[PDB]
Amino acid sequence: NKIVSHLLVAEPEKIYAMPDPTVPDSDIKALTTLCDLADRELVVIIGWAKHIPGFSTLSLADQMSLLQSAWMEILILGVVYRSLSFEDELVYADDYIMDEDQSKLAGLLDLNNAILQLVKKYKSMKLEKEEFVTLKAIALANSDSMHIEDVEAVQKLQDVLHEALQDYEAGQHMEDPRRAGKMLMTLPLLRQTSTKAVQHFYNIKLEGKVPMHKLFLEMLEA
Numbered sequence: 001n002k003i004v005s006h007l008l009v010a011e012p013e014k015i016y017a018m019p020d021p022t023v024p025d026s027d028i029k030a031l032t033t034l035c036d037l038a039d040r041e042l043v044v045i046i047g048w049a050k051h052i053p054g055f056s057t058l059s060l061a062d063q064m065s066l067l068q069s070a071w072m073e074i075l076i077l078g079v080v081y082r083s084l085s086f087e088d089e090l091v092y093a094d095d096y097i098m099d100e101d102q103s104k105l106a107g108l109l110d111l112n113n114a115i116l117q118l119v120k121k122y123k124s125m126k127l128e129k130e131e132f133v134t135l136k137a138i139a140l141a142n143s144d145s146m147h148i149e150d151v152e153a154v155q156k157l158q159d160v161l162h163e164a165l166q167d168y169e170a171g172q173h174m175e176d177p178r179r180a181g182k183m184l185m186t187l188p189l190l191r192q193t194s195t196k197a198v199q200h201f202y203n204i205k206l207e208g209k210v211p212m213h214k215l216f217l218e219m220l221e222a
């Protein structure tokens with residue numbers, strides 16, 4: 001598959017959390033570590049997205065729209081995938097892994113348990129790298145931004161990625177004629193826990209103890 005193949009190649013290189021053992025552990029250390037990690041990943045996502053066929057020919061405003069609705073889905077799906085071969089831990093990066101006890105120390109228990117629900121589902125499906133990268137692309141195209149101007153063009157991007165996934169499954173998973181549909185039926189859980197995650201920003205902001213960038217605060221309030 002042309003599209004699956006280029007997506008495999010466009011997969012970004014590992015990113016490291018670079019946590020510092022001289023800062024005493026705390027919910028604040030954990031959360032600001034996750035913020036720096038995520039902003040470096042967001043920068044990688046923009047370069048990555050220009051390898052999605054059709055994405056870079058949308059208007060500036062449409063590209064912003066799609067990415068504004070999908071970035072947390074893309075981030076979480078990466079964490080999900082990196083944890084497939086672990087048990088009840090979330091692999092944020094090779095050097096930043098969270099078990100149940102550290103989730104609680106960070107205030108992220110309920111959120112991380114929701115994510116581990118996704119890990120569990122994809123584990124039993126034996127999710128392949130090929131499927132993960134096409135799912136990531138589909139999460140972007142299917143973001144359901146309310147702002148899109150060129151609805152016809154985004155519908156076409158979803159169809160091209162949808163077609164790539166189905167084609168891949170038709171060839172590599174003939175023992176399951178409905179595997180592509182099973183993959184797509186995990187997307188509602190993905191969007192569910194991105195909304196849970198974005199909503200958590202507001203808890204953190206209200207409590208006021210963890211420092212946030214002033215641009216982020218402005219975005220949150222708006």
Ligand SMILES: OCCC/C(=C(\c1ccc(O)cc1)c1ccc(C2CCN(C3CC3)CC2)cc1)c1ccccc1
Binds near residue numbers: 034039041197198
């Ligand atoms: O438990 C799972 C959720 C972890 C997590 C993550 C996270 C997810 C995946 C990943 O790979 C790395 C990190 C997170 C944290 C900070 C941001 C920032 C805010 C600041 N940025 C603006 C400056 C531009 C925008 C991004 C983005 C994501 C999170 C999310 C909400 C509350 C608390 C923790």
